[PDB]
């Protein structure tokens, strides 16, 4: 009857446009990243200009 939301102890895990998204199906925690980022936690930027 509520949306607890993602935890706040991971220390901003997802970086560079990291929107926490709790998947009920997979039953896990994932984050959405933009194109260009792939490095661990989308930390590294792989911009193609």
UniProtKB/Swiss-Prot annotation:
Gene designation per UniProt: Egf
Domain EGF-like: 2-42
Name of the protein this chain belongs to: Epidermal growth factor
Cysteine disulfide partners in this protein: 6-20, 14-31, 33-42
Organism, scientific name: Mus musculus
């Amino acid at each position: 009857n509520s949306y607890p939301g993602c935890p706040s102890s991971y220390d901003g895990y997802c970086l560079n446009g990291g929107v926490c998204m709790h998947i009920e199906s997979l039953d896990s925690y994932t984050c959405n990243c933009v194109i260009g980022y792939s490095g661990d936690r989308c930390e590294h930027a792989d911009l193609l200009a």
